[PDB]
């Protein structure tokens, strides 16, 4: 169970940059972002080998404690036992997740959140640096 | 209230770096480090002009809700309307706080925490970057 942070006060268009170490035995890691632990506009879950998925990013939302429908992504620029940085911005319509090696995707902001105040990391990812601008 | 982070798992000898923006009319700011809001190995409180103090760093501990004996440090290398970084490490005997302009001081480690797991920021300091290394 990894870093939990609150009172982030991230506003639309502002960049949240997260750099960490992907464990050498990595199977899965998670970054959760939202209003609080029950209201997530982004559950970001790269699965190296987990829950039947191989090298697939799965995203979801959580609204008032209820998980939404999982969305699978098309790119996977992560390797076990490496450093990786993710950069996230949002607006009320979409989150934009920028990944290593120039990859990126958008995920709809199902909560239409105008501020992100909560982040939590879990799984095979050791955070080394968080930046807010 | 500003950023609150938990599960930091900062081990002895590891460096926590915190960079932020000091408000142009700053009066004071606080970084609290420890186990939780009731158990702080370091309450670090630069006062530009607050509580009768001028350009003085006030430090203390808090153990089971009880404030310890305050200490006041010798140097004040902070300026309103600037960017400032602090860097903190600890061993069993002391926390070492490294300040802008190369200044550093030690504060006794009065608690027996195996790791620093909690940070909370308050006051006239906007955190821009936190690094765990
Ligand atoms: N400023 C703004 C304008 C529009 Cl139009 C939209 S929307 N409705 O296309 O998502 C969102 C925003 S923001 N930056 O608050 O998320």
From Swiss-Prot, chains A, B:
Tissue-level expression: Expressed in placenta, maternal decidua and fetal membranes. Within placenta, expressed in trophoblasts, stromal cells, villous endothelium, syncytiotrophoblast apical membrane and villous stroma. Within fetal membranes, expressed in amnion, chorioamniotic mesenchyma and chorion (at protein level). Expressed in cardiac, smooth, and skeletal muscle, neurons, thymus, kidney and hematopoietic cells.
Keywords tagged on the record: Acetylation, Apoptosis, Cytoplasm, Extracellular matrix, Lectin, Phosphoprotein, Secreted
Chief site of localization: secreted
Phosphoserine, modified sites: 28
N6-acetyllysine: residues bearing it: 11, 27, 106, 126
PROSITE patterns: GALECTIN (PS51304)
Subcellular location: Secreted, Extracellular space, Extracellular matrix; Cytoplasm; Secreted
Modified residues (N6-succinyllysine): 106
Entries under SUPFAM superfamilies matching the protein: Concanavalin A-like lectins/glucanases (SSF49899)
Cellular component aspect of the GO annotation: collagen-containing extracellular matrix; cytoplasm; cytosol; endoplasmic reticulum lumen; extracellular exosome; extracellular region; extracellular space; galectin complex
Keyword Nucleus attached: no
Signal peptide: none
Molecular function, one GO term: lactose binding
Top-level division of the source organism's lineage: Eukaryota
Gene Ontology biological process: apoptotic process; cell-cell adhesion; myoblast differentiation; negative regulation of T-helper 17 cell lineage commitment; plasma cell differentiation; positive regulation of apoptotic process; positive regulation of canonical NF-kappaB signal transduction; positive regulation of inflammatory response
Every Galectin domain range: 2-133
InterPro entries: ConA-like_dom_sf (IPR013320), Galectin-like (IPR044156), Galectin_CRD (IPR001079)
Keyword Iron: no
Positions annotated to bind a beta-D-galactoside: 43-47, 51, 60, 67-70
Subunit structure: Homodimer. Binds LGALS3BP. Interacts with CD2, CD3, CD4, CD6, CD7, CD43, ALCAM and CD45. Interacts with laminin (via poly-N-acetyllactosamine). Interacts with SUSD2. Interacts with cargo receptor TMED10; the interaction mediates the translocation from the cytoplasm into the ERGIC (endoplasmic reticulum-Golgi intermediate compartment) and thereby secretion. Interacts with CD69.
Protein name per UniProt: Galectin-1
Source organism of this protein record: Homo sapiens (Human)
